[PDB]
Amino acid sequence: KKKVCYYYDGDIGNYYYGQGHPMKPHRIRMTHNLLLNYGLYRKMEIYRPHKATAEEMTKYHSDEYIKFLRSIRPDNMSEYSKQMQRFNVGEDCPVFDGLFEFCQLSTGGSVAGAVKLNRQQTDMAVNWAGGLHHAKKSEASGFCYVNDIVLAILELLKYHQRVLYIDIDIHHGDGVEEAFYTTDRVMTVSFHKYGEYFPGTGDLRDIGAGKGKYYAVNFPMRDGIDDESYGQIFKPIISKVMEMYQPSAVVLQCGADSLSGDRLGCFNLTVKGHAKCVEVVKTFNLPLLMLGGGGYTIRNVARCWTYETAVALDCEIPNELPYNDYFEYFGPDFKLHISPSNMTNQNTPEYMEKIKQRLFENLRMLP
Amino acid sequence: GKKKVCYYYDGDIGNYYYGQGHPMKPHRIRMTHNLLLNYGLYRKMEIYRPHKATAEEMTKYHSDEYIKFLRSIRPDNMSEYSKQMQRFNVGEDCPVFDGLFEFCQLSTGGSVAGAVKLNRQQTDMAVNWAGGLHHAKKSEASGFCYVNDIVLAILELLKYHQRVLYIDIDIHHGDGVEEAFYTTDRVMTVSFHKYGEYFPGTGDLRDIGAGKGKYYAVNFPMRDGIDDESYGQIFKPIISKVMEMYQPSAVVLQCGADSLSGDRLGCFNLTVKGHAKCVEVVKTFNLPLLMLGGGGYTIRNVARCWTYETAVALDCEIPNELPYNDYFEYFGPDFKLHISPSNMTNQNTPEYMEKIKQRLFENLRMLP
Amino acid sequence: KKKVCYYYDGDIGNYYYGQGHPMKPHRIRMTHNLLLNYGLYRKMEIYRPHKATAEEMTKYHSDEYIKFLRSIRPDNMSEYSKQMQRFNVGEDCPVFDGLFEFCQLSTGGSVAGAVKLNRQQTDMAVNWAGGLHHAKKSEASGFCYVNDIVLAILELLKYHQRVLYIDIDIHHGDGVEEAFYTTDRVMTVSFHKYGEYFPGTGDLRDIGAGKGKYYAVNFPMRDGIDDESYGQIFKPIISKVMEMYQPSAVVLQCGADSLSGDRLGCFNLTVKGHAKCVEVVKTFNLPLLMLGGGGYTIRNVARCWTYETAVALDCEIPNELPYNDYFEYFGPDFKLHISPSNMTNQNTPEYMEKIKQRLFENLRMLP
Ligand SMILES: [Ca+2]
Ligand SMILES: [Ca+2]
Ligand SMILES: [Ca+2]
Ligand SMILES: [Ca+2]
Ligand SMILES: [Ca+2]
Ligand SMILES: [Ca+2]
Ligand SMILES: [Zn+2]
Ligand SMILES: [Zn+2]
Ligand SMILES: [Zn+2]
C-alpha cells in the first residue's frame, strides 16, 4: 500500500513553557510512546529531523524577529522590553529555556517532510510536533513562534503548482491564511470556532484578495459541534474543493483542541470523528503532510494522534490500550476511544446549511 | 444613526483666480456647492458662512513675519518684495494673486469655525470643502497652499481633546500637517499617497515621527494606478487598527480629490464611490469629525466627489442622474454623478499592498 | 578591511533598447537603489564614471567601428544600411537613442576601475554597467557594442604581467577569449552552457593558440546546474589556476543570466551559489575588478548584484528587503535570496568530474 515517513526528536518532550502554561510539549512524547507500543513503528520509517536553520526560517519570517528569538533568554528580558512588545513575546508566548531550539525541531520535521514528498520518496509524512499555525512574519501569537506550516508549504511549492492546506484545529489558522492570502497557488480551508474567541479572524466573508480571491475558505462555527454535524460539512466541502481546485499536494493540520473535553476548546468531537477527516483526505490519493497543532487535554491528544497515525497506515488498532510508559494517565478505562460530552451543540441546522451554501457559491467562482 | 452636519461655504470663494494656466481653480468649490444645492442637500444640513480668520488666529501656528508678508503682498507691489517672495516661497507654484490674503482667511475660517462647533458639541460633523491646505509650512507657502487651515483647526481641537487623529486621502503626502505634529503624540497623522519622484518628496513609510511623536506618524506609500478594490482593502484595516491602538476623541479627514481617476495632475484610478468609501469607514467610528477639501484638478470630478461625500455624511442616497445646475455642461458627455475608472495599469500589486500594511501594523504594535 | 570602489552613472537606467528587447539597463538603477536602501553606500567609495573617449575605445576596437557607433542614430539609419550590416548593428543589437553615450558610460566605469587598481588606490573596483563580453574588435554581438572588459584588461596589463579573467555569465565570453587567445599574459576561464546555445563557442577543446596555448580554459555545462554542483567545480578549478598561473590581478564578470528563473538562461543557481564565486576569488587577496554581464529577470539581477556588493564589502545583509523605489518588483516574497526551481540538473556528477579532470590535465601543461 502507501509509504509513511514519521518525524520525532526525543528531546521535544523536554521543553517547558512555564508553570501553569497550558501548552505541554510532553504530549508529543506521550503520543510517540503510545504509538510505539501499538507496534506502528514496524510499519513506518522513523526519522530524527535536522534542526531548521535560522536562514531557513527567514524564508518567511523577518530577520530581526528570528535574530530576536535566537537571542532572548529568561535572564536577559530586561534589555529587550521594546523588542518583546514589537514581536509579542513575553506573555502568552513566553520566553523559556531552549525556545529557539524548540522552534528548530518543530520546523525541521515539517520542512524535512515536505522535502521527502517533493522527492517522491514517500506518500505521507507526519510531524506531530508541527502545526504552529498562528505565528506571523514578525510576531509570535497563540503559543506559536515560527510558522513551520508556511515554511513547509513554501518548500512544496518548488515542485507543486497547487497546494491545499486544511485546518481542523479549533482555532482559525490565521498565520497560514495571511501568508497565502493573495495567491492562488495555495488554497487554505479552515474550520474553527468563531465569535468572541481567539484569534478573532476567519469570518465567512474572508475569501482572499488579488489573484488569491476565492482561494481562502473559512467555516466559522459555534460551541458544541459534534461528530455527525462536523462530518456532514467536512466531506462535502473538501470534496468540492478537491474537484474545483485540483491540488497536487495536501497539508493537513490536525490540531486536537477540537476534541470533546479539551481544556481550552469548546467542541464535542471524538477521536473517531476527528480522524474521519484524515480518512476523507486520504481517499484522494495525493502526497500528504500531516501536522499537529493545539491540544490541551494531553491524554486525549495522545489517543487522537495515535489513532490518526494508524489511519494513515491503514491499520485497525484495538480499543484496549497496550501497556506504555504513561499507562496510568489513561485511566480509569485505559481505552483508545473517548465519549462525547452532553454539551449543547449551538450550531443549528439552518446556520450550518446557510454557511455551506455560501461556501459552495464561492467555490463555483474558481477557474 | 444619522448625524447633525454643519457645512461652511463662502459664495465669494469661487472668484479667486490663481492666474492663467494655473491648475488650482477655486471655482470648483462653487461648482460643488451648486451641485449639492441642486440635489436638495441644503434641506438636510446647516449652511454657515465662514468668518475671515484673523492674523491672531493664523499665528497660533505660522510665523508673525510670514503672516505679515501674506497680508502685505499684492500684484502691484510685487517688485518691492522680490527678496521676501523667495524667502517665503511665493511667486511661482504659489503665485501672488488679487485677494490672496482674503482667500486664506476664508479657507481657514471655515476649518477653525468647524473645529469650534465640534468642541462645543454643537455638531457631530463639520464640512469645509474650501479647506484641506496640507502643504503649507510654518514660514513658507508650498504646493498652491499658503496657510495651513488643518494645523490651525487641529490646534483648536486640542483645546478640548487629548488625542486627535488626522487622515489624509489626497494623492500627495500631507507634509505640512505631519511636520507640525511630528514630535507629539497628541495628533497621530496617517497619510496614504503616491510616493517616488512625486511632489512633495516626503512620506516614506520609514518616517514614523520622533521623540514623544515616535510611532504617531503613519505613511502608506503607493505607486501609480491604484484602484477602488486595492485602496478599500487596506484603508479599512489600517484605520481600524489605528482607532483601536490610538483611541482618538476627534478626527480630521482631508478628502483631496486629486486621487480620483482622470485627475489632471494625479496618477491614481479611484472612482467617486471608492474615494467616498473612506468617508463611510471613518463615519462608522461615531467620533466628532471635521471633513476638509484638498487637491483636485479635473473640476467636474471634484464637484462630483465632494457632492457625493456630503450625501454620505448625511446618510442620503442621491440619484446618479445629475440635476440641472448652473454648471451642467461641465458634466458632459454623460451628465451622471458617478465616474468610471480608466484602463491604466495598477502598479500596486496585491502583495505590495499587504506587505506595506504588514510593516505599518508592526509599528502600530509599538503604541502603549 | 580591503577598500571597495563602485561606479554608477544615474543616467544609465534611462537607455532603452526598444520595445520587447530583453536587455533593460534599468536593472542597474534597481541594483543601485537596493544597495542604497540597504545602507551599503556608507561602506564604499561611489564614483560617477567619465564618458570613455573614442581614443580609449580604439585601444582595442577599430577606428572605423567606433566612428560608426558615434554617428549612427534612429533618424539617420536609412543612410547607413551597409555600415549597419558590416558592423552588425540594427537587429539583436539595435540602434537606439543615446547608444554611443551608453557605451561610453559602461566602458568608462571598467577602465576607471582598472586605473584605480593599477594605482593601488583600491583593492576592489565594481562596475555593474560593464561586462559586455560578446563585443568584437569591429562588430557588435549579443546586445554588446564596446568590449569594456577587453579595454579594462588592456589597462591592467600596463602594470600587471599576468591577469586572470573569470566569467560566470551563462554565455561563453567569446569577445574576451578571442582578444587574448594568442597571449599568455591573460588567462581566460569561462563556465557556460554549451550545445546549440549562443554564441556557439567555448568548447572544452578550445585551449588557446601560439604563445597562448593552454591559457584559455572553457568548462562547458548543460541545463540545470545547481549551487552544489557549480560550487564543487568552481573552487578546485580556480584554485588550480591560481596555483599554476599566479596572476597579479583578476577580472570577474558576474553575469546574472546564470541564475535560476532567468528569462533567457537555463541554469538553476541561487544568489548565494552565484555569490560564492565572488567569495572564492576574494580569498586570493589580489586586486579585483568585478563587472556585471547578462541577466534578464531584472528583480533577480538586482538581488544578485546587491548581494555580491555586500560580499565584496564583507557585510552580511538581511534577507528581508528594505523599502526602496522599486519595492513592488520583488513580490511576492520581498526577500533578497531566491529559491532554486525543480528543473532537472542535466550535469551528472560523472560528467562534472570528467570535464574537471580534462581541464586539470591542460592546466598541468603550464610552466
Ligand atoms: Ca481550524
Ligand atoms: Ca490563498
Ligand atoms: Ca495623502
Ligand atoms: Ca504626530
Ligand atoms: Ca561564462
Ligand atoms: Ca589567453
Ligand atoms: Zn488551536
Ligand atoms: Zn494633492
Ligand atoms: Zn549572458
**CATH number for the domain harbouring residue A42:** 3.40.800.20
In 3D, which of A154, A165, A150, A148 has the Cα closest to residue A49? Answer: A148
Identify which of C251, C301, C264 has the alpha carbon closest to the alpha carbon of residue C113. C251
Element (H, E) at C63: helix C63-71
Of B350, B354, B366, the CB nearest to A86: B366
User: Residue ranges of A for the binding site for Ca(2+)?
Assistant: 167, 169, 171, 180, 183, 186, 190-191, 215
Cis peptide before A199 (omega within 30 of 0): yes
The per-residue DSSP string of B1-57 comes to -PPPEEEE--TTGGG----TT-S--THHHHHHHHHHHHTTGGGGSEEEPPP---HHH
CB neighbour class for A299 (10 Å; exposed up to 12, middle 13-18, buried from 19): middle
Residue A60 CA to residue C335 CA, distance in Å, equals 8
Distance between CA atoms of residues B129 and B132, nearest Å: 7
Using alpha carbons, list the distances in angstroms from residue A153 to A82, A187, C330.
Answer: 31, 11, 20
Of all residues in chain B, the one with the smallest CA distance to C328 is: B352
With residue B292 as reference, give the H or E element that holds it: strand B289-292
Catalytic position from the list B33, B135, B161, B193 = B135
Q: In this complex, which chains have at least 3 CB pairs below 8 Å with chain B?
A: A, C
Q: Which ligand is nearest to the CA of B175?
A: 3
Parent domain of C34: 4-363
Residue carrying the nine cell digits 602594470? C159
**Cβ-Cβ contacts under 8 Å, A212 against chain B:** 350
Could you say which of C320, C337, C339 has the minimum Cβ distance to residue A158? C339
Looking at residue B97, the DSSP 8-state letter turns out to be -
- The residue of C315, C320, C328, C339 whose CB has the most chain A CBs within 10 angstroms, and thus the best one to mutate to test that interface, is C320
Burial class (CB in 10 A: 0-12, 13-18, 19+), B324: exposed
Cβ separation A59–C319 shorter than 8 A: yes
Rounded CA-CA distance A267/A243 in Å is 28
Percent helix / strand / coil, chain A, rounded to 5:
40, 15, 45
How is A193-246 classified by DSSP, letter by letter?
A: E-SS-SS----TT----GGGTT-EEEEEE-TT-BHHHHHHHHHHHHHHHHHHH-
If you measure from the C-alpha of residue B184 to the centroid of ligand 4, how many angstroms do you get, rounded to a whole number? 5
Burial B251-269 (b: 16+ CB within 10 A, else e): bbbbbbbbbbbbbeebbbb
Q: How far is CA B93 from CA A202, B19, B83, in A?
A: 50, 11, 17
Q: What is the full DSSP assignment across A69-108?
A: HHH--TTTGGGGHHHHHHHT-SSSS---TTHHHHHHHHHH
- Residues whose CB is less than 8 angstroms from the CB of residue C213 and which lie 6 or more positions away in sequence, other chains included: C207
3-state secondary structure of A188: strand
Question: Using CA atoms, how far apart are residues C39 and C48, in angstroms rounded to an integer?
Answer: 18
CA atoms within 13 A on the CB side of C147: 30
Query: How close A41 comes to chain C (CA, Å)?
Result: 32
Long-range pairs for B357-363 at CB < 8 Å and ≥24 separation?
B357/B220, B357/B234, B357/B237, B357/B238, B358/A137, B358/A138, B359/B205, B359/C323, B360/B205, B360/B218, B360/B220, B360/B238, B361/B241, B362/A86, B362/A138, B362/A139, B363/B208, B363/B215, B363/B218
CA distance B38 to chain A (A): 38
To one decimal, the resolution in angstroms is 1.8
Q: Which amino acid is at C331?
A: G
Separation of alpha carbons B150 and B290, rounded Å = 10
Coil/strand/helix, residue A308 = helix
Whether residue B130 contacts residue B29, with contact meaning beta carbons closer than 8 Å, is answered with yes
C-alpha B160 chain-centroid distance: 22
CA of C312 to the centre of ligand 5 (A): 20
Instruction: Check B350 against A138: CB less than 8 A apart.
Output: no
Among candidate residues A61, A133, A134, A274, the one labeled active-site is: A134
Structure-determination approach = X-ray
Q: Report which bound ligand comes closest to the CA of C168.
A: 5
User: Who among A59, A159, A183 is closest to C342 (CB)?
Assistant: A159
Residue (of B314, B297, B271) closest to B39 by Cα position = B314
Return the HEC string of B66-78. HHHHHHHCCCCCH
Q: Does an H or E element contain B168, and which?
A: strand B164-168
C20 is in an annotated binding site: yes
In one-letter notation, the amino acid at residue B18 is: Y
Q: Which of A55, A158, A183 sits opposite C332 (nearest CB)?
A: A183
By C-alpha distance, which of B139, B330, B133, B150 is closest to B252? Answer: B150
Q: At what angle do helices B100-119 and B64-72 cross, to 10 degrees?
A: 130
Separation of alpha carbons C120 and A46, rounded Å:
59
Q: How many domains does chain B have?
A: 1
Query: How many angstroms separate the CA atoms of C258 and C269, rounded?
Result: 7
A235: its cell numbers: 466531506
- Residue C130 near residue C292 (C-beta atoms within 8 A): yes
- Provide DSSP, A173-186: -HHHHHHTTT-SSE
B-C contacts (CB, under 8 Å): 23
Taking contacts as CB-CB distances below 8 angstroms, the residues of chain B near A139 are 362, 365
Residue B217's closest CA among B248, B253, B243, B191? B191
Give kind and range of the element (H or E) at residue A154.
helix A148-156
Element (H, E) at A109: helix A99-118
C-alpha A143/C-alpha A310 separation (Å) is 28
C4 is in an annotated binding site: no
CA distance A50 to A111: 10
Q: How far is the CA of B174 from the centre of ligand 3 (A)?
A: 5
Quick one: closest CA in C to B197, which residue?
C325
Give the side-chain half-sphere CA count within 13 A for B33: 20
Torsion region of A24: left, alpha or beta (phi above 0 gives left; psi -120 to 50 gives alpha): beta
| Amino acid code (one letter) for B242 | V
Cα–Cα distance between A173 and C34 in angstroms, integer? Answer: 34
CA–centroid distance for A153 within its chain: 13
How many contacts does A have with B, using Cβ atoms within 8 A?
A: 25
Residue ranges in C255-363 assigned as alpha helix (H): 271-282, 298-312, 349-363
Q: Is the peptide bond before B75 cis (omega within 30 degrees of 0)?
A: no
For residue B33, which of B302, B363, B353 has the smallest C-alpha distance? B302
Please say whether the beta carbons of B134 and B122 come within 8 A.
no
* A46: enclosing H helix or E strand: strand A45-47
CB contact under 8 A, B347 and C331: no
CA atoms within 13 A on the CB side of A129: 33
Confirm whether B135 is a catalytic residue: yes
Q: Among C125, C139, C143, which residue's Cα sits nearest to residue C64?
A: C139
Distance CA A55, CA A63 (A): 9
Cell of C262: 532567468
Residue of A nearest to C344 (CA): A159
Residue A159 φ then ψ, to 5°: -120, -5
- List phi, psi (to 5°) of C320: -75, 120
Other CB atoms closer than 10 Å to residue C171's CB: what's the count? 26
Mutate one of A59, A67, A184 to test the C interface: name it (highest C CB count within 10 A): A59
Q: Test A212 with B366 for CB contact under 8 angstroms.
A: no
CB contact under 8 A, B352 and C328: yes
Q: How far apart are CA A11 and CA A102, in angstroms?
A: 9
CB contact at 8 A, C157 and C134: no
Locate the chain A residue with the closest alpha carbon to B365: A86
Residues in chain B: 368
Distance from residue C150's CA to the centre of ligand 1 (Å):
62
Per DSSP, the residues of C236-282 read HHHHHHHHHH--SEEEEE--GGGBTT-SS---BB-HHHHHHHHHHHH
